[PDB]
Design a protein around this motif. Structure first.
Motif, PDB file in Angstrom:
ATOM      1  N   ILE B  27       4.174  34.737  27.684  1.00  0.00           N
ATOM      2  CA  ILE B  27       5.370  35.325  28.085  1.00  0.00           C
ATOM      3  C   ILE B  27       6.430  34.962  29.594  1.00  0.00           C
ATOM      4  CG2 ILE B  27       7.707  36.810  26.796  1.00  0.00           C
ATOM      5  CD1 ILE B  27       5.907  37.815  25.712  1.00  0.00           C
ATOM      6  N   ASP B  28       7.411  33.784  29.268  1.00  0.00           N
ATOM      7  CA  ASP B  28       7.735  33.443  30.222  1.00  0.00           C
ATOM      8  C   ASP B  28       8.123  34.331  31.059  1.00  0.00           C
ATOM      9  OD1 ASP B  28       7.521  30.909  31.583  1.00  0.00           O
ATOM     10  OD2 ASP B  28       8.668  29.926  30.381  1.00  0.00           O
ATOM     11  N   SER B  29       9.523  34.724  30.206  1.00  0.00           N
ATOM     12  CA  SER B  29      10.451  35.554  30.055  1.00  0.00           C
ATOM     13  C   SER B  29      10.370  37.400  30.547  1.00  0.00           C
ATOM     14  CB  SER B  29      11.901  35.087  29.454  1.00  0.00           C
ATOM     15  OG  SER B  29      10.530  35.941  27.392  1.00  0.00           O
ATOM     16  N   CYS B  78       2.720  38.666  31.067  1.00  0.00           N
ATOM     17  CA  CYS B  78       4.259  38.598  31.088  1.00  0.00           C
ATOM     18  C   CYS B  78       4.103  37.937  32.381  1.00  0.00           C
ATOM     19  CB  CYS B  78       5.016  39.324  31.482  1.00  0.00           C
ATOM     20  SG  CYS B  78       7.216  39.639  31.031  1.00  0.00           S
ATOM     21  N   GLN B  79       5.051  36.346  32.607  1.00  0.00           N
ATOM     22  CA  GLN B  79       5.502  36.065  34.341  1.00  0.00           C
ATOM     23  C   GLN B  79       6.313  36.762  35.038  1.00  0.00           C
ATOM     24  OE1 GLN B  79       7.462  32.048  35.470  1.00  0.00           O
ATOM     25  NE2 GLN B  79       5.482  31.376  34.740  1.00  0.00           N
ATOM     26  N   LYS B  80       6.967  37.958  34.180  1.00  0.00           N
ATOM     27  CA  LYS B  80       8.004  38.785  34.804  1.00  0.00           C
ATOM     28  C   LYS B  80       7.832  40.428  34.957  1.00  0.00           C
ATOM     29  CE  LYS B  80      11.300  34.441  35.753  1.00  0.00           C
ATOM     30  NZ  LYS B  80      11.708  33.745  35.139  1.00  0.00           N
ATOM     31  N   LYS B 102       1.742  35.299  38.221  1.00  0.00           N
ATOM     32  CA  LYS B 102       1.269  34.054  38.603  1.00  0.00           C
ATOM     33  C   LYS B 102       2.053  32.902  37.700  1.00  0.00           C
ATOM     34  CE  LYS B 102      -0.153  34.365  43.510  1.00  0.00           C
ATOM     35  NZ  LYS B 102      -0.813  33.826  44.721  1.00  0.00           N
ATOM     36  N   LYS B 103       3.497  31.804  37.881  1.00  0.00           N
ATOM     37  CA  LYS B 103       3.343  30.786  36.520  1.00  0.00           C
ATOM     38  C   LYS B 103       2.351  29.953  37.504  1.00  0.00           C
ATOM     39  CE  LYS B 103       6.515  27.065  36.145  1.00  0.00           C
ATOM     40  NZ  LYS B 103       7.100  25.987  37.305  1.00  0.00           N
ATOM     41  N   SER B 104       1.796  29.894  37.838  1.00  0.00           N
ATOM     42  CA  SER B 104       0.862  29.018  37.635  1.00  0.00           C
ATOM     43  C   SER B 104      -0.342  29.808  37.294  1.00  0.00           C
ATOM     44  CB  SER B 104      -0.304  28.915  39.760  1.00  0.00           C
ATOM     45  OG  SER B 104      -0.473  30.075  40.199  1.00  0.00           O
ATOM     46  N   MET B 106       0.025  31.773  34.250  1.00  0.00           N
ATOM     47  CA  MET B 106       0.540  31.342  33.708  1.00  0.00           C
ATOM     48  C   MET B 106       0.263  30.012  32.557  1.00  0.00           C
ATOM     49  SD  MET B 106       1.969  33.867  32.351  1.00  0.00           S
ATOM     50  CE  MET B 106       2.503  33.906  31.290  1.00  0.00           C
ATOM     51  N   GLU B 107      -0.338  29.127  33.386  1.00  0.00           N
ATOM     52  CA  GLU B 107      -0.620  27.707  33.028  1.00  0.00           C
ATOM     53  C   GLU B 107      -1.741  27.373  33.134  1.00  0.00           C
ATOM     54  OE1 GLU B 107       2.814  26.250  36.200  1.00  0.00           O
ATOM     55  OE2 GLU B 107       4.272  25.435  34.414  1.00  0.00           O
ATOM     56  N   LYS B 108      -2.593  28.244  33.996  1.00  0.00           N
ATOM     57  CA  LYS B 108      -3.313  27.712  34.676  1.00  0.00           C
ATOM     58  C   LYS B 108      -4.354  28.370  33.695  1.00  0.00           C
ATOM     59  CE  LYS B 108      -4.887  27.806  38.477  1.00  0.00           C
ATOM     60  NZ  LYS B 108      -5.429  27.460  39.708  1.00  0.00           N
ATOM     61  N   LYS B 116       0.278  28.832  23.836  1.00  0.00           N
ATOM     62  CA  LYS B 116       1.618  28.209  24.622  1.00  0.00           C
ATOM     63  C   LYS B 116       2.749  29.559  24.779  1.00  0.00           C
ATOM     64  CE  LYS B 116       2.362  24.854  23.325  1.00  0.00           C
ATOM     65  NZ  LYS B 116       2.118  23.613  24.334  1.00  0.00           N
ATOM     66  N   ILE B 117       2.881  29.041  26.342  1.00  0.00           N
ATOM     67  CA  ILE B 117       3.619  29.773  27.127  1.00  0.00           C
ATOM     68  C   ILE B 117       5.337  30.026  26.445  1.00  0.00           C
ATOM     69  CG2 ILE B 117       4.203  30.899  29.044  1.00  0.00           C
ATOM     70  CD1 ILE B 117       2.720  29.247  30.607  1.00  0.00           C
ATOM     71  N   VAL B 118       5.523  31.348  25.682  1.00  0.00           N
ATOM     72  CA  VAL B 118       6.757  31.410  25.168  1.00  0.00           C
ATOM     73  C   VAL B 118       7.811  32.234  26.089  1.00  0.00           C
ATOM     74  CG1 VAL B 118       5.383  31.398  22.669  1.00  0.00           C
ATOM     75  CG2 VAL B 118       6.375  33.646  23.883  1.00  0.00           C
TER      76      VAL B 118
HETATM   77 NA    NA Z   1       5.708  28.544  33.349  1.00  0.00          NA
END
Ligand code: NA
Ligand code: NA
Lengths: 152, 152
Positions: B27-29, B78-80, B102-104, B106-108, B116-118
């Motif tokens: 989760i991005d959020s 969670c990214q946050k 970290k966002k990186s 999350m993608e990695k 799939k990052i929702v």
């Molecule tokens: Na992201």
């Protein structure tokens, strides 16, 4: 006073129909949560503590409401509104609650039953309560009113 | 990937130490309550409905948080941030949760495990989850990290 009529009904159905030997609490202030005050606590909150706060407030209010039961009272007549959940708490606590009682009635009842109309619910000592033989729901015509009889 | 290291630990002690055959949610959020949105609902509320609202929100959030368990997931990165009570819910649900990844990473991890990052937790279908043989807490030196091994 072998009678004082209040043109307002008990707030919930599951509340007592008649209350024998009633110690009555008189509150000037609304039994409600202050908007501006909790908005601000939400606003100044650490984002990860939002729910902690809402939960601490749900407890803080319920405690504020229980100060009626704890002061011994079994009847509460509020001059203003009473939060709906607060009305639930009292209905469970089996207390006869009335909201939006006119200021004149509040004073009229103060003298008659001997209670002291408080505002700050912490000053709700069992000494500021009023007394009456019975407090009952009564339906005249299509009005549901409250009779405060045997005022002592 | 017979290995992806994340420099972040599971959020609660009472959370699993090792998770076998993990379906992972990304989760991005933030798993948090929006301040501005609940302040406004408090502000526009009927004074007698304040507590009703706080209660409805306590349920609405807990439900938003349960969409992780319900999507089958047993690991959430969670990214946050993650609200403290939300962290409690997951610890009870027995889910391995990590916040502020970290966002990186999350993608990695997205590529490596196939998730799939929702952002919107309603799009949290069991199809957007990732997979890995094990997800474990690991302490290198004085860092508590998370190893995502057997990425499938
Ligand atoms: Na992201
Ligand atoms: Na008054």
């Amino acid at each position: 006073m072998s009678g004082i009529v209040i043109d307002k009904e008990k707030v919930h159905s599951k509340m007592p129909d008649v209350v024998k030997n009633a110690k009555i609490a008189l509150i000037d202030s609304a039994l409600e949560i202050k908007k501006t005050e909790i908005e601000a606590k939400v606003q100044i909150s650490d984002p990860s503590k939002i729910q902690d706060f809402l939960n601490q407030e749900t407890n803080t209010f319920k405690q504020m409401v229980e100060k009626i039961k704890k002061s011994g009272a079994n009847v509460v007549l509020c001059q203003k509104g009473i939060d709906d959940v607060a009305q639930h708490y009292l209905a469970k606590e089996g207390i006869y609650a009335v909201r939006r009682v006119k200021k004149s009635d509040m004073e009229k009842l103060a003298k008659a039953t001997g209670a002291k109309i408080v505002t700050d619910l912490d000053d709700l000592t069992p000494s500021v309560l009023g007394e009456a033989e019975t407090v009952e729901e009564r339906k005249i015509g299509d009005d549901r009113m409250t009779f405060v009889m045997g005022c002592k």
